[PDB]
Structure formats: C-alpha cells, structure tokens
Amino acid sequence: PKLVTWMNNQRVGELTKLANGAHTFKYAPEWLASRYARPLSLSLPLQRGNITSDAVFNFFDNLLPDSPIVRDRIVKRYHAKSRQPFDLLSEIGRDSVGAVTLIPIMAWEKLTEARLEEVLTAYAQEKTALLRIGNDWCIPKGITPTTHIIKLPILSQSVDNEYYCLLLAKELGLNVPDAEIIKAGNVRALAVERFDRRWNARRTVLLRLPQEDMCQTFGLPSSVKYESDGGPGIARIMAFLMGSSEALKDRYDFMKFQVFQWLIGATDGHAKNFSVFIQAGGSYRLTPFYDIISAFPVLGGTGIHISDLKLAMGLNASKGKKTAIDKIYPRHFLATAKVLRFPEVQMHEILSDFARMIPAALDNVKTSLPTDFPENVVTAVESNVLRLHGRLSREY
Numbered sequence: 001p002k003l004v005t006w007m008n009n010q011r012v013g014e015l016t017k018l019a020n021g022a023h024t025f026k027y028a029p030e031w032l033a034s035r036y037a038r039p040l041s042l043s044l045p046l047q048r049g050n051i052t053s054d055a056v057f058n059f060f061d062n063l064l065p066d067s068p069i070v071r072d073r074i075v076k077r078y079h080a081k082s083r084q085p086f087d088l089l090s091e092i093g094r095d096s097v098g099a100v101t102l103i104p105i106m107a108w109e110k111l112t113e114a115r116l117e118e119v120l121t122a123y124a125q126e127k128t129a130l131l132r133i134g135n136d137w138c139i140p141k142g143i144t145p146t147t148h149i150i151k152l153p154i155l156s157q158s159v160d161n162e163y164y165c166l167l168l169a170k171e172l173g174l175n176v177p178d179a180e181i182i183k184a185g186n187v188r189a190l191a192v193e194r195f196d197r198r199w200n201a202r203r204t205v206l207l208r209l210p211q212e213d214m215c216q217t218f219g220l221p222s223s224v225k226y227e228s229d230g231g232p233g234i235a236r237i238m239a240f241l242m243g244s245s246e247a248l249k250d251r252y253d254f255m256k257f258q259v260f261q262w263l264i265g266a267t268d269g270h271a272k273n274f275s276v277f278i279q280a281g282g283s284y285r286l287t288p289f290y291d292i293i294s295a296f297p298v299l300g301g302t303g304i305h306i307s308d309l310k311l312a313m314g315l316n317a318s319k320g321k322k323t324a325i326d327k328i329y330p331r332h333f334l335a336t337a338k339v340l341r342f343p344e345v346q347m348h349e350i351l352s353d354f355a356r357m358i359p360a361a362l363d364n365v366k367t368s369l370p371t372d373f374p375e376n377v378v379t380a381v382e383s384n385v386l387r388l389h390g391r392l393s394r395e396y
C-alpha cells in the first residue's frame with residue numbers, strides 16, 4: 001500500500017497506507033541528501049524517520065476536492081477501489097496541484113472541438129485540467145503535465161464572473177493568473193493558466209512547481225478552512241508571511257487582496273484560496289491569488305441582500321470583528337494593519353491606489369470582454385464596486 005512521490009523527475013519519498021488505515025510518509029535518502037532539498041509541505045518537515053502525524057493524511061486529503069459528491073464521481077470515473085483518499089490519489093495522482101506526482105516523454109493528444117466538448121461535459125463544482133499547445137487544447141500523455149485548470153459554470157454565470165474578476169484584479173495590479181473563456185460546442189468554460197507549471201526556455205519540457213495551500217501549510221484538514229470553524233484568518237496568515245522569502249511584498253499583496261475582495265464582494269476567500277510556493281531549501285513565498293468570484297451577481301437572484309454579504313476572513317472592529325461588506329469602511333483596514341504591524345503608510349497607499357485607479361480599471365476591463373459576455377454580470381459588479389469605491393474616494 002505505497003504511492004511513490006515524485007517532484008518532476010526526482011523521487012521525493014513514499015506515502016504508505018497501513019492496514020489499520022493510518023497514513024505515513026517517509027522521505028527518500030537521495031532526496032534528503034540534496035543541498036537543495038525541500039519538504040513536500042511545511043507541515044511535513046525534512047526528516048529521516050517515518051512521519052505518522054495527522055499532518056500526513058491531511059496534506060494528501062487536501063490535494064483532492066472537498067465535496068463528497070465530487071469524490072463519488074471520481075470513484076465512478078476510474079472505478080476507484082473505494083472513496084478513500086489514498087485510493088483516489090492512486091487513480092488521479094499523476095497530475096495534481098503543485099508538483100506532487102503519485103505513482104503506484106513530453107507528448108500529448110490534440111482534441112478537436114467536438115472532442116473537447118465531450119471531455120468537458122464529463123465534469124459539487126469539480127474542476128479538471130488540460131494541456132494547451134499553441135491554440136489547441138490537449139490531453140497530456142504519461143506524466144506530461146497540464147497547463148490550465150478548467151472550470152465549468154457552478155451561479156450559472158460563474159465562468160464569466162471569475163473571468164471578469166481576474167481581469168479586474170490584473171488591471172489593479174494584483175498577482176493573478178491569466179484566464180480565457182473557452183467555447184466548445186455548447187460548453188462555455190473558464191481556462192485558468194496554472195502558476196504551478198513552467199515551460200523551460202526551449203519549450204521542450206514542462207515543469208511542475210511545488211506549492212501548498214494554507215490548510216496544508218498549517219497541517220489542517222480542509223474541514224477547518226473557514227475562520228468560523230477554527231481556520232486561519234488574516235492574523236495567522238500575516239504572521240506566517242513574516243517567514244516568507246518575500247515578506248514585505250507578500251504581506252502588502254495579501255493586505256491589498258483583502259481590500260480587493262471587499263470591493264468586489266468576494267465572500268469565499270477561505271484559507272484554501274491562498275497558497276505558497278515551496279522553494280529549494282524549504283523557503284516559501286505567496287503564489288498568485290486565485291478562485292476569485294464576486295457575490296454581487298447573485299444579489300436579488302432570490303432574496304440575497306447586499307447586507308447579507310460577509311468576508312470569509314474578518315477585519316478588526318472596535319468591538320470585535322468586522323465582516324459585512326456593506327459596513328466596512330477604510331478605518332477597518334487601517335485598524336487591522338495596526339494590530340498586525342503592517343505599516344500604515346502602506347495601507348494608505350493601498351487604499352489611495354484603489355481610490356484613483358478603480359474607475360479607469362473598470363472601463364479598461366470591458367475591452368477584454370467577449371461580445372457575448374453577459375451584461376448583467378458587468379452591471380452587478382461594476383455598480384457595486386463603484387458604490388464601495390466611493391468610501392475610498394471620500395477619504396483618499
């Protein structure tokens with residue numbers, strides 16, 4: 001009951017699943033010997049002995065979708081031995097988030113539009129991935145990696161929503177992946193460029209880059225990804241970012257992203273929505289932001305009010321925490337920066353920058369929207385962002 005763990009062409013170690021169900025991991029000697037060795041996770045530090053803490057199971061479980069519905073689909077798809085994580089990874093672990101390849105050259109298969117449509121229809125929001133070669137979507141062969149995360153609509157306009165949000169984030173200076181709306185027959189999907197992949201200079205090899213999300217970095221199960229369930233919030237992440245190889249930048253970017261989520265009404269920014277690259281030696285830094293969706297297009301859809309929108313990670317408030325997007329003003333971000341030791345001049349710069357740049361960014365994003373982009377999505381997001389933006393322009 002072993003799965004060999006590879007990081008590209010280098011053997012990292014082995015995941016073992018004992019008869020009693022316990023999961024253990026052991027690094028390979030040749031891996032530990034490298035002066036450039038790095039751990040699979042900050043929660044699984046380099047060592048010679050077997051690692052038996054719950055961090056092993058949690059780390060691997062976090063590589064799989066959180067929804068039980070999606071896991072049942074996976075079992076069905078590959079007739080997986082069971083619903084267990086070790087068994088699921090035995091079927092789909094060749095290409096995962098980050099660089100972890102789990103096994104029990106460069107080549108691919110180009111897909112036609114008809115074939116691409118069929119592949120995507122198969123995919124409780126289960127995402128998949130494909131390899132882009134030129135202007136064609138492809139299925140990679142063997143251990144050849146994918147280059148894009150493909151998402152289908154959830155929120156029937158979630159593909160368009162996320163596309164818009166990623167464009168706006170990029171226009172406002174945030175580190176986010178590029179994405180494109182793809183159409184195959186009657187399917188409309190979002191193809192997000194992966195930042196855990198990098199082509200070599202000659203484009204003959206596509207490499208995987210190690211990364212892990214915040215639940216993984218802290219050894220936590222996906223079940224506590226939300227702060228209300230005991231998961232990490234702004235304080236814990238900002239404290240963690242102090243050890244980043246890019247601390248100043250990462251803390252600034254993370255705080256800027258909290259202001260951005262507020263402006264765009266992104267209510268689902270839980271711990272698994274943030275990740276770090278694990279670099280040679282074991283150092284780490286923040287990866288780009290991702291899985292960005294605005295709740296504004298859902299307003300009025302049934303009964304959901306703007307007063308019902310809450311940030312997943314709350315800010316400081318005089319009497320506790322501040323979570324309602326509609327009640328948040330610059331003073332909450334400034335109070336938060338203070339207790340977290342995030343330079344006030346920097347928080348001001350972040351607020352000032354959004355104050356003068358938002359109006360132009362909203363107009364600029366429109367040119368990158370396809371002709372069939374849904375106007376209701378633009379109106380709902382643009383109108384609500386401008387309403388909140390007024391609170392910044394009034395002080396900054």
Ligand SMILES: [Cl-]
Pocket residue numbers: 321322323324327
């Ligand atoms: Cl509040």
